[PDB]
């Protein structure tokens, strides 16, 4: 039957004490296969299943610096959402990102994903067509307006139609 | 590989 890949990136604010904790966890189908935690002494990146060991040191090193960059996106964007929602800087907040792809045996793509949740509420989501966006409230409307104008959907579509699927079968070809 | 650097909110 069908198969899927899913990445859950999560960032949470901490009272006073410096930068937000960063979490990134990868799922193949619904099984966890890869994980990144900023709280770890040497944060890096790591394998969560045995069959992901056969990956080269280049794969892990590159994928780690990608997550190191992702932390900056969250630091910045947590800050902008405080502006949109008129919230105080002395508070703590959660911003989660989910992306990935669905395929079921046609070695083709069924569905793409690029969506965001803020403090456990839906913010913005890429629609099934990967052209339009669902915005939950007024703050998300601002994002939706400029993502439609700039062509963010097309930006994300280059990954979801290409690399997302390719790497999924690359991963599926294991175990 | 991971998705490209996401757009700004």
């Amino acid at each position: 039957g069908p198969h899927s890949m899913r990445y859950y990136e999560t960032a949470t604010s901490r009272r006073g004490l410096g930068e937000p904790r960063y979490t990134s966890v990868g799922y193949v189908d619904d099984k966890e296969f890869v994980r990144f935690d900023s709280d770890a002494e040497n944060p890096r990146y790591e394998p969560q299943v045995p069959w992901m060991e056969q990956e080269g040191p280049e794969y892990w090193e590159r994928i780690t610096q990608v997550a190191k960059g992702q932390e900056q996106w969250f630091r910045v964007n947590l800050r902008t959402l405080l502006g949109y929602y008129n919230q105080s800087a002395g508070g703590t907040h959660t911003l989660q990102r989910m992306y990935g792809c669905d395929v079921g045996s046609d070695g083709r793509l069924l569905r793409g994903y690029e969506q965001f949740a803020y403090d456990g509420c839906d913010y913005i989501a890429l629609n099934e067509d990967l052209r339009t966006w669902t915005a939950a409230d007024m703050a998300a409307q601002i994002t939706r307006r400029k993502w439609e104008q700039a062509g963010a959907a097309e930006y994300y579509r280059a990954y979801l139609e290409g690399e997302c699927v390719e790497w999924l079968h690359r991963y599926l070809k294991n175990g | 590989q991971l998705s490209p650097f996401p757009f700004d909110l």
Partner: single-chain antibody, 224 residues
């Protein structure tokens, strides 16, 4: 990596059709842009390509077609006015570094019969002087850039920044310091001005990978 524009100089009669060529050699198919630069102004984006429809519509009546097999992104316009006389830059963004915009050599077109504010429009000093170029933008963009353009050539990236306090090196950073003190402000500093640092400096801000809004330019001459 690289982008290639075959002809530095192009002359077409007014009312005629234009095609400006661009070819890229990249390991992965990059993000593709065309920019226009009218005399005494910063570059302005014409159109952009990420994916999907290989034919994209630009501003001022331009359109471009992407071709994977040909590795090309040629620009074209049905009927050229006199006001189209400018320098046209094919530009590219690497897949892993979407916000770092790199320019082609440029094509000067002769057709014959951006809330980014930068503080010093013109400046002349001598060797050894401290020079600071200011740049402020009220667009709420998180990306800011400092480029330099030697007259006759393309914009070359010095430094860029993503959010306050961030600093990322460009292609030609030697001799420069930069500081992103706030979201809106990005200073460029020449601690000891050298005669090799005489050129046209452009600040820019961005909201979306490779889509830049340029200031009006700070022309600096440093004399020995």
């Amino acid at each position: 990596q690289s982008v290639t524009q075959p002809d530095a100089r192009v002359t077409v009669s007014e009312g005629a059709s234009l095609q400006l060529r661009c070819k890229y050699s990249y390991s992965a198919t990059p993000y593709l842009f065309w920019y226009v630069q009218y005399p005494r102004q910063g570059p302005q984006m014409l159109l952009k390509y990420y994916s999907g429809d290989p034919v994209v519509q630009g501003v001022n009546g331009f359109e471009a077609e992407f071709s994977k097999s040909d590795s090309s992104f040629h620009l074209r316009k049905a009927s050229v006015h006199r006001s189209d006389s400018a320098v046209y830059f094919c530009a590219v963004s690497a897949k892993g570094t979407g916000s770092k915009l790199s320019f082609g050599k440029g094509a000067k077109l002769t057709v014959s019969p951006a809330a980014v504010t930068q503080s010093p429009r013109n400046k002349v000093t001598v060797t050894g002087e401290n020079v600071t170029l200011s740049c402020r933008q009220t667009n709420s963009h998180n990306y800011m850039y400092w480029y330099r353009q030697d007259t006759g050539h393309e914009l070359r990236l010095i430094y860029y920044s993503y959010g306050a306090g961030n600093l990322q090196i460009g292609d030609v950073p030697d001799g420069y310091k930069a500081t992103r003190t706030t979201q809106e402000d990005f200073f460029l500093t020449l601690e000891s001005a050298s005669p090799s640092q005489t050129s046209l400096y452009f600040c820019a801000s961005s909201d979306a990978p490779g889509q830049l809004y340029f200031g009006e330019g700070s022309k600096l001459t440093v004399l020995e």
